[PDB]
Symmetry: C2
Subunit: 647 residues, 2 copies
């Protein structure tokens, strides 16, 4: 195999992030064997030095001379830091000149929690490390590639980031899933701009042989958290005691005592009985309700949900003795995970890191593929109906009738026409009691109050100025106006109006900057994430995530950025649509797309634009009309969550 | 490049259909250079001999000995013939033993007409040549691959056959598009069964450099046909004259005389004026309405539509002198076609046949990809919203109100519960005047009349026994009961219950046969094609194409075959949804899928099954309620045609 690689990439320069181990180290190894000069970037110096020494030794074995000139390293490189990415490019260009191949391989697992347990800064950090870093390196290296007349950008995505026309849920990993979907969406939308000189593609393996036990423990700890939280929420619906008083029932941390307490609500007694029946008697989770870590996550969910509880409520919690989960429990769960994964591999074999790197070095030699995602995955398939669609009608008159007297929250600022039309449809057609218009600025509040002057005067339209504090604004709306039914989350900001590539012989100074790409993610992805994270614990809410608007006259740049957002947000919507099922609130969350892939499909005249606006109202109604608990079966429930419809 | 291929496929045996030229000849050439022994199959002996001589000469140049043992040919091989495919396999195994790589490359362009102008036997012939031949060779060679423990099936599909989660319309080529989608669907659904031993993938390039002028002439001739037919149909709606009398206005074959005739309906005068204004004055199509060929296609559409006209009506038509379309007209149209294609290539370069073959020889060396489609296409992209979806409601109460007094046609036999529930919803909920239940057999008629006994007695449910004569049965329904509004086309037959692969050391005798795969296409694709072809010219019809049913307890084979049909039919639905826009009738045609990809998504209990059946009724209503002409804009019209919704 080493002989057959000779000369394949001779004369090429490759930059590989996360190049000290895994797929990254193997790509670096095989590209060096194929003749390329490689720069391997990573955090840990020692692991990076070992990888460089191993590759250099192998090059010398197969006949290469001056092996030190062929494999360089960039240690202490944290791809989540913009300054460190600029230093990495400086070092790489100083060593080898123009980079031919940018291998965006570095990646972190992320927060590994459900959205409702995910710190906002943790989500942002995953986007910086896994996604924004890819645009940042492309922005720095593409001008030089264009100048020389050739280049290749390869983003190492994941099958769990989804596929071109089918999003995939990845519960407890939404930050990771979104970053992976974005790496693929970058290849899908930038190909038109990077061509003809530069190819851009992604690879999307799933499991790669180089884990199930670590995953198993997280699953068991998460299950305990979810079960406890859902039981407290369900008990609170029909019990007059405060959440503080209900949480007091947990303070002895005694499963049998809670089960046997006739004053405990039915939901909590049944939960304790389930812990005893399902539990391994040797596990302390069979006899203790929770530990310090789970108690902290539970308290955070309750505080986020608006419950009043002292910060030290679990300070005296008895600490359960190890093991909280036995080896038998962890092993049983690890086997379930393993079997679930193996069952998705139609070649019945997980590809190795070497297999993925080998497939990639041959992808890098092709010159006719661009804007695609390759799947060197072992025939990995997760069967699922695609989450998208454009032919829909309205929900039934009986579901629409349930909107009479409802409290609607609309979030937005730049889409004034959509916000005005939607507030009016809810108040004038569907008899909603009130609409709370949560804007970003006082200028936004003035604009919306002017548009909805009649409803403001009648006390039917109220405004809230969120600024950069959307969660606190939602809490103010809850205090002032009551909990919402429909929640329609539109972006506060429009998309930027800037070029996405520069002219061949230009400095690219006006091209979308690395900081502007981070801002695009903040306003168009993080905005929705924060709202969904908060609204997920608001009992009775039905949330619609709305993407930016494309029109028949949008620029090609506008279409590219809007479709990048649309695809990337689908991963978030699909993931949180599944996570919703693990909560007692089990809210509806779906996406309504004001972005189309094709300019030709857009309305072209006043009549067609009117039809589009009516479809927007209908799409929002379809995902915001309530779904009766009786109709909310496992079958129907999944159809009404995590979907995306195109207006 | 020839040196780097050495040993890549040494020890391999490849069978390449259509191996005398194009992509096929290049795959044969490059696989032989890589060390494989190749069998090249094709119709023409001379072209095949030349290709074999060229490859053998190149092998000798690079050092191969005994070149006659490495490249064999199978001339006079018509892949549309089952007996000829059996002879091809016999010849190949006799020459080289077990085939490692099956390259399903042979393909014909097909009928190259809109569905309404496509002979049923022409459509069948394209399926035999392009699609059924692929299953047939797989069925013959996969047992030997499984026995040796390895194999690879590569189907040469087209980007115009669509993508995994996004169908694509290919107007005037529905037979070709369907065959291509089926080649890809075969890889998507058989991968689970063929693994671990055998990989199955497709390639989907679009344009390949080795045409636009030939395409241009077909477009211009088609435009004349469509314009003439649409004007006659539109004039007939408001004119008391018979179609025979309206066609008499065309018999002098004089554009200026028709334009100047004050007795001619407005639609025909305006059409003649448009021919004169748009036409090149040197083209005889500017002065003559039609020629013999177009007149025959026009007469066929009118006869199919039920118009009474003598077979010799155009026997005395003046023959227009050449050129019917000038070089300037043909060249202008050829440039439009070329620019349209080039604009879709994000690498701004059409791949050559050599480029596609090179990409393929490297795909054939990979061992970790299966069930995928590769795109060595030059970055080819046709931006479009995916045609599928599962979140939908009902059409508006005002659209549903228009079903009062409607004539409904239901076609089916095996889905008795669905047919009974739908006939009842139309009659009992939506006040339809009558339902015509078109079954296959008298036993089917007896079953449906028993289920709908009450409606039969009241004269609200009538039956028709179609047998294998569905078009004639529809014509009998038109005579007896009147033209339909909603038309719901379900398959007469269930899917077969047979294995799709055999045990490693078995003879595979019970595995789905080549004849059974042809029958599956007849009952599950051709059935819908024939109904859509006929109903497309029935003014006021709204047609729903329904796929087979999958359930929570369907076998994995059932799921595979149903999803193969679902995906393949999406290509047909999308294509005819666009072709509908070229007709005055402009009917609605959409697909309602009773097949899901995922067993886990299926209803599991009586309540959920009830919810699924209600969703089936809602999906059918959404695509069968009328779309007002005023609302049928270019924008809204495309959303209501060619879609597929998942129940």
């Amino acid at each position: 195999w080493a002989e057959s690689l000779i000369g394949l990439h001779l004369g090429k320069v490759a930059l590989i992030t996360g190049g000290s181990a895994g797929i990254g180290g193997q790509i670096g190894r095989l590209l060096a064997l194929s003749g390329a000069r490689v720069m391997l970037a990573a955090r840990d110096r020692h692991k990076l030095e070992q990888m460089q020494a191993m590759i250099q030794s192998e090059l010398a074995e197969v006949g290469y001379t001056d092996v030190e000139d062929r494999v360089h390293i960039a240690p202490g490189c944290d791809v989540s830091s913009e300054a460190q990415l600029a230093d990495l490019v400086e070092r790489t260009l100083s060593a080898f000149g123009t980079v031919d191949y940018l291998i965006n391989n570095a990646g972190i697992a992320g927060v590994e929690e459900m959205v409702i347990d995910m710190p906002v800064e943790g989500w942002r950090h995953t986007l910086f490390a896994n996604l924004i870093s890819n645009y940042s390196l492309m922005r720095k290296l593409a001008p030089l590639m264009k100048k020389q007349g050739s280049g290749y950008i390869l983003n190492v995505s994941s099958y769990f980031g989804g596929e071109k026309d089918a999003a995939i849920p990845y519960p407890n990993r939404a930050d990771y899933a979104v970053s992976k979907a974005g790496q693929r969406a970058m290849a899908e939308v930038f190909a038109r701009f990077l061509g003809p000189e530069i190819q851009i593609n992604a690879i999307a393996p799933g499991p790669v042989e180089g884990l199930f036990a670590r995953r198993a423990r997280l699953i068991l700890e998460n299950k305990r958290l979810n079960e406890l939280h859902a039981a407290l929420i369900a008990a609170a619906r029909t019990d007059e005691r405060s959440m503080h008083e209900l949480v007091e029932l947990l303070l002895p941390n005694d499963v049998a005592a809670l089960e046997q307490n006739p004053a405990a609500p039915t939901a909590l007694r049944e939960l304790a009985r389930r812990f005893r029946s399902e539990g391994d008697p040797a596990a302390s989770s069979s006899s203790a309700l929770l530990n310090r870590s789970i108690a902290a996550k539970l308290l955070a969910r309750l505080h986020n949900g608006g419950y009043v509880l002292p910060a030290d409520i679990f300070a005296n919690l008895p600490n359960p003795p190890d093991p909280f989960f036995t080896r038998a429990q962890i092993d049983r769960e690890a086997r379930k995970v393993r079997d679930g994964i193996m069952g998705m591999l139609y070649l019945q074999r997980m590809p190795t890191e070497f297999d993925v790197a080998m497939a990639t070095v041959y992808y890098l030699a092709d010159r006719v593929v661009s804007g695609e995602t390759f799947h060197p995955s072992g025939g990995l398939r997760y069967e699922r109906t695609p989450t998208g669609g454009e032919l829909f009608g309205l929900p039934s008159p009986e579901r629409l009738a349930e909107l009479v007297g409802s409290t609607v929250y609309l979030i937005g600022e730049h889409l004034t026409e959509h916000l005005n039309l939607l507030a009016r449809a809810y108040l004038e057609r569907y008899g909603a009691r009130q609409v709370v218009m949560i804007v970003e600025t006082e200028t936004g509040a003035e604009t919306m109050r002017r548009l909805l002057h009649d409803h403001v005067e009648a006390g039917r339209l109220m405004t809230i100025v969120a600024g950069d504090q959307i969660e606190a604004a939602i809490d103010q709306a809850i205090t002032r106006y009551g909990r919402p039914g429909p929640v329609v989350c539109t972006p506060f900001r429009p998309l930027p109006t800037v070029p996405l590539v520069g002219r061949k012989d230009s400095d690219w100074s006006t091209v979308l900057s690395e900081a502007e790409f981070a801002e695009l993610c903040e306003h168009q992805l993080t905005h929705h994430f924060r709202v969904a994270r908060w609204i997920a614990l608001s009992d009775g809410a039905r949330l619609a995530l709305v993407t930016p608007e494309t029109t028949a006259t949008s620029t090609t740049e506008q279409f590219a950025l809007a479709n990048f957002i649309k695809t990337t947000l689908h991963a978030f919507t699909a993931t949180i649509g599944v996570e919703s099922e693990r909560t007692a609130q089990r809210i509806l969350i779906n996406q309504v797309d004001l972005t189309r892939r094709a300019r030709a499909e857009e309305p072209r005249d006043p009549h067609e634009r009117q039809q589009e606006l009516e479809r927007f109202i209908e799409a929002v109604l379809l995902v915001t009309a309530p779904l009766p608990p009786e109709a909310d079966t496992r079958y129907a429930g999944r159809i009404h969550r995590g979907r995306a419809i195109t207006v």
